[PDB]
Amino acid sequence: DNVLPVDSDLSPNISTNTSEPNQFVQPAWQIVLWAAAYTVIVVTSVVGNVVVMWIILAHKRMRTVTNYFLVNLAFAEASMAAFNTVVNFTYAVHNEWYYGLFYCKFHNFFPIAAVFASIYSMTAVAFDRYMAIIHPLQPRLSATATKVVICVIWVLALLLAFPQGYYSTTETMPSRVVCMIEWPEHPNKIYEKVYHICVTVLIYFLPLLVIGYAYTVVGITLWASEIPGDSSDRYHEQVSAKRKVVKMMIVVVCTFAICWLPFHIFFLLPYINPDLYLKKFIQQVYLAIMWLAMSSTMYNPIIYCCLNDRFRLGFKHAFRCCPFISAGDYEGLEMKSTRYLQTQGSVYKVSRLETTISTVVGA
C-alpha cells in the first residue's frame, strides 16, 4: 500500500516529494485548494496575532503575567503565519517539496517547535490560573520570572523539536508538503521508533494531562458560574473579573485540543501500524489533520475578542487611530485608571490600590 509516499507504487508513478509534483496522490485542484486555504490563513493569522501582540504591548494597562504568556502564544502563532505557512503555501502550489531535504528539515523543525511551545505554554497558563485562584497573595510572583518561564518553555520545546535535526527521525506528510516526524518507517539507523513514542507522550500527551489536571483543581475553586456584577457569588470585582479570564483560558485550551488532537492520534496510529491503512491510510487523512492544526493559529485572536471586553475595547482603541472608543468602553479597567493604551487613556503611573502598593504597579 505504501512507498516512501503514502500511495503505493504499483505503478512506477510514485516520485519523491523532493523531486516532483505528487499530482498522482491527489487531484491538482486539491493542491490549489490547500494552497488557497493557506493563503487566506496567512492573512488572518498574521493580522489577528499581530493585533494581540501589538495591543497588549501598546496598552500599558494590559500588563498581567497572563498577558505575558499570551504574547508568547501569539508569537508562536506569528511564526506559523510568517515562517511555516509561507513555505507550506509554496509547496502546495508547486505540488511538492521544491526546497528539498534540507528545507523539509527546516520546515518541520520550526513548525514542530511552534506546536510544542503552544501546548506547553497553555500548561503554564493553567498552573498560573491555579496559583491565582488558590493564593491571591500577589507577592509570590514576578514578571521577571514569567519571562524566564517563557524562555524555559522554548528551551523544552527545542528539546523535542531539535533532536530530529540531531540524528533522529525525519519526513514529509501525506500529500505532502508539510513536514513532520517520521511515523511511517522505522528507519533503523535513525532510531525512529523510540523517538516517536517519546515525543508524542512526553511533549503532547503529558502536558495535555497536566493542563487537564490543573483544570480539575480549578473546578473546586472559581468555576464557570460568574455573575456579571461583582455582587453575587463573587467576592470582589477583581474576583469576579478573574473568572472571565479563566473561562477564556479554558476555551483557548479546548480549541487547541480539538485542532491538534486528531493529528496526534493519527501520529500514533500509523506508528503502530505503518505500511497499512487506518480506517484508510491515505494522503487525505494525514493531510487534513495537519493542515487543520495550522488553523489553530487563527482561532485565538477571535476568542479574545469574543471572550473579553477588556481586550475588545482596548483593541478598538488601537484600531481607530484616535481614541474613538465608544461602545461603553471597558466599563471597568480599560486601564485601572481609566482608558488604557500606550497613551490616551493609560495614564502614566496608573493608580495604586491600598496604602501600600498592592499590585506591583505605579512603581
Binding site: 512507498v3 516512501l4 510514485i14 516520485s15 519523491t16 523532493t18 523531486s19 531535504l101 525525519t170 539507523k189
Partner: peptide
C-alpha cells in the same frame, strides 16, 4: 523517484 534517491543518508 523516492527509491533511487535513497541518498537521504544525510538526515
Amino acid at each position: 523517484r523516492p527509491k533511487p534517491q535513497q541518498f537521504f543518508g544525510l538526515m
